[PDB]
Amino acid sequence: LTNSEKSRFFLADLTGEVQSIPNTYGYISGLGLFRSAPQTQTTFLMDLTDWD
Amino acid sequence: LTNSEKSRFFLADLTGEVQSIPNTYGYISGLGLFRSAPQTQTTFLMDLTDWD
Amino acid sequence: AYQGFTKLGEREPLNDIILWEEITPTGHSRKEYAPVASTEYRVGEVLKADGSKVAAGQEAQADSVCIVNFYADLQLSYHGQLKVVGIYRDAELKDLLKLESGVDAAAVKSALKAKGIDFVPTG
Amino acid sequence: AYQGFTKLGEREPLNDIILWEEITPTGHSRKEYAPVASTEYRVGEVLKADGSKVAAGQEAQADSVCIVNFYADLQLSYHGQLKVVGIYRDAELKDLLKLESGVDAAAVKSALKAKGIDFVPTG
Amino acid sequence: NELTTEAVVRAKKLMKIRTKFDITREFLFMQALKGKVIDANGVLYADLYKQFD
Numbered sequence: 323l324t325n326s327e328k329s330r331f332f333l334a335d336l337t338g339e340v341q342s343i344p345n346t347y348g349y350i351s352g353l354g355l356f357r358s359a360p361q362t363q364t365t366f367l368m369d370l371t372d373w374d
Numbered sequence: 375l376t377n378s379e380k381s382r383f384f385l386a387d388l389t390g391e392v393q394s395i396p397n398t399y400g401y402i403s404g405l406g407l408f409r410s411a412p413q414t415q416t417t418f419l420m421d422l423t424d425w426d
Numbered sequence: 427a428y429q430g431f432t433k434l435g436e437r438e439p440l441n442d443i444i445l446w447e448e449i450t451p452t453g454h455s456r457k458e459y460a461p462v463a464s465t466e467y468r469v470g471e472v473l474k475a476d477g478s479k480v481a482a483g484q485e486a487q488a489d490s491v492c493i494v495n496f497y498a499d500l501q502l503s504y505h506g507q508l509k510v511v512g513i514y515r516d517a518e519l520k521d522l523l524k525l526e527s528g529v530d531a532a533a534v535k536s537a538l539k540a541k542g543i544d545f546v547p548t549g
Numbered sequence: 550a551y552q553g554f555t556k557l558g559e560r561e562p563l564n565d566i567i568l569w570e571e572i573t574p575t576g577h578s579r580k581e582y583a584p585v586a587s588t589e590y591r592v593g594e595v596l597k598a599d600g601s602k603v604a605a606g607q608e609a610q611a612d613s614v615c616i617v618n619f620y621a622d623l624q625l626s627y628h629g630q631l632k633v634v635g636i637y638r639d640a641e642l643k644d645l646l647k648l649e650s651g652v653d654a655a656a657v658k659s660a661l662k663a664k665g666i667d668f669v670p671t672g
Numbered sequence: 673n674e675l676t677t678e679a680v681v682r683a684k685k686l687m688k689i690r691t692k693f694d695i696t697r698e699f700l701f702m703q704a705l706k707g708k709v710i711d712a713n714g715v716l717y718a719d720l721y722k723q724f725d
Contacts (some may be wrong), residue, residue: 323673331437380620383560403698428624501551
């Protein structure tokens, strides 16, 4: 019971609360493929050695 | 707390209620002059006797 | 507030204008109208045959008196309904009639009285 | 003539577009306007010096961004205030803006950039 | 957000009716004290001065 429509002396029920939430995908992130490698600098280097 | 004046999503405050009862002057009825005389008929008679 | 004051509005009159009506099971004194066009209805206003109110001069029409508070803009009613209802047949009502500008009451009451509507004096 | 059902309304925008401003003892970034007669203000509406909204062609005359909700018939803001206020000096605002029909958004943004108002990209 | 009850309306209407009758009784008592019992509409019901000559 909040109020009527265009009259402050009558009432009406509530029910209400129909939430709508956007859909988010998390399959690749849920796969857990990537290993966390924290570092301190802003750039990092790697070496590539091959004796084919 | 009730709905605002022009918006259905903002709240205002209902301070209270002020009544204006009309004034009635009961004074003669409070004097208690007229004696109640319940009657079982639609009309009653009286006898007036006098001499000189 | 601005210009010193804001009034949120007098309450529209309720449906207590009834004192006695025929209580036929499917409605004897009640008749069914359709709101005409952007027209606001309250209780106790005299309505013509075609859902419209009685103006000056056309007092003889005086089909019925409204008993609902219809809101024109949303096309719903005082109770949340699609159609306005007035009372047009034999019944007794308080004389809380709502009349337009320039329309006298004596001709309106006489037209309603000849139809069956009687107006109890009100204090 | 009743179509579908009724929409009571949509919530007026909240005063939340302000992300940063020169907050001082007084309102350095915000100025007051005397509301124009029969004009209704919402949050995020661009105003000119006189206090009216920016129309087409007058984009260069943009002065401030309204941050309160005013009602024309009530002549009060939604906070029970008497005058409409808006951000005109240097500040950072969200990208949500309400412009009139045919109003160049880019021209309005550049005019506000000159005074010092910035618009953070909003998703 | 409180609804009105039938008992409240019943009591209010009954109180109004009782007060109406009380004020009517006071008016009629005053009219009788004046000497002629004239109803508010103006109709004469009992002219004491003429009855008692």
